[PDB]
Amino acid sequence: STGSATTTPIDSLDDAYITPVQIGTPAQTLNLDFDTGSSDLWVFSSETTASEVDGQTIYTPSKSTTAKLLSGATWSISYGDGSSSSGDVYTDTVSVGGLTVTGQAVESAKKVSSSFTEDSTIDGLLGLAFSTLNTVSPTQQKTFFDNAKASLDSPVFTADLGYHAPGTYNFGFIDTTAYTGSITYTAVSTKQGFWEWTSTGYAVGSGTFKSTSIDGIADTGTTLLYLPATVVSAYWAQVSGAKSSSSVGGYVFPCSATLPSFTFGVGSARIVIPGDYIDFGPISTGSSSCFGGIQSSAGIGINIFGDVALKAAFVVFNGATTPTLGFASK
């Protein structure tokens, strides 16, 4: 089997991407944030505290003839940005882009934090990291990819995120028309439950490539590119007027600037992030100070290749017995 679904930016900054997902019988279609940095499939639902729902589409399990309460199961998750959600669990039929999994754990939110409530465009998350991170208790549950893997033509999914434009998530096959050149594959550690790999270095604009190992995670659920303070300082030093602002919470730069590109290494290959991809616009409406898309990881504890980096590439998440990641230019 295979599946193929279009993923669409939620706003003009590409702050996140939503992909339609069919849940239950008859189908209830919710727009979920596919997140390779977490491992829970959770949804706004008929059980969510009413004051915490503000425009999202909800899953109503009582209207699904295939929904079954997973008795005793609860879940509770906290994300790197400080947001959180929790609830109980059903199993139901879930389809993405024509690919169907029966018996998928669908985590129904009873509570969500304010940032979820405030984002009317995201109806939940679909986690695509390793199932060892799933928060369901007392019986941990498998991700959608883990459940579908055996049925897929090839045990892979691919992320092809657009810059200010729609893109595609494919399951079970590699679309050779979707990228240029060849795919360079690189080793993955699953020891922290993430798609964790080691970049071989970086360049800033037309500058020379610096060979240096940068361990980090491929995370479609994080907007920006978070890298060590040395690397980020070297980038922003090439932008006149750029500075790190503690009051804003990161590097800002004059909105009048033209940003340099940023290159990251994948083995001997190179992925170029155009400068425009690093512009996240005014810090507040009407300001001439703009927020940078490359930020320091020093306060996180891990480097994060988020959407800013991933959308410059065609990315293969290879879930073979020894997982690997692949990157191609496009």
> Is the torsion defined by CA of 285, 286, 289, 291 positive or negative?
positive
Active site residue 86: no
- Gap between the Cα atoms of 308 and 310, Å rounded: 6
**HSE of 61, CA atoms in CB hemisphere, 13 A:** 23
Q: How far is CA 149 from each of CA 70, 142, 143, 155, rounded to the nearest angstrom?
A: 22, 11, 10, 5
Beta-sheet pairing, 324-328 with 314-318 = antiparallel
79 φ/ψ angles, rounded to the nearest 5 degrees: -100, 165
List 33, 35, 40, 88, catalytic entry: 35
Residue 261 is given by DSSP the state: P
- Gap between the Cα atoms of 79 and 20, Å rounded: 22
List 199, 261, 296, 297, catalytic entry: 199
Q: How far is CA 42 from each of CA 6, 117, 244, rounded to the nearest angstrom?
A: 20, 14, 35
Active site residue 199: yes
Determine how many CB atoms are found less than 10 A away from the CB of residue 297.
18
Active site residues: 35, 199
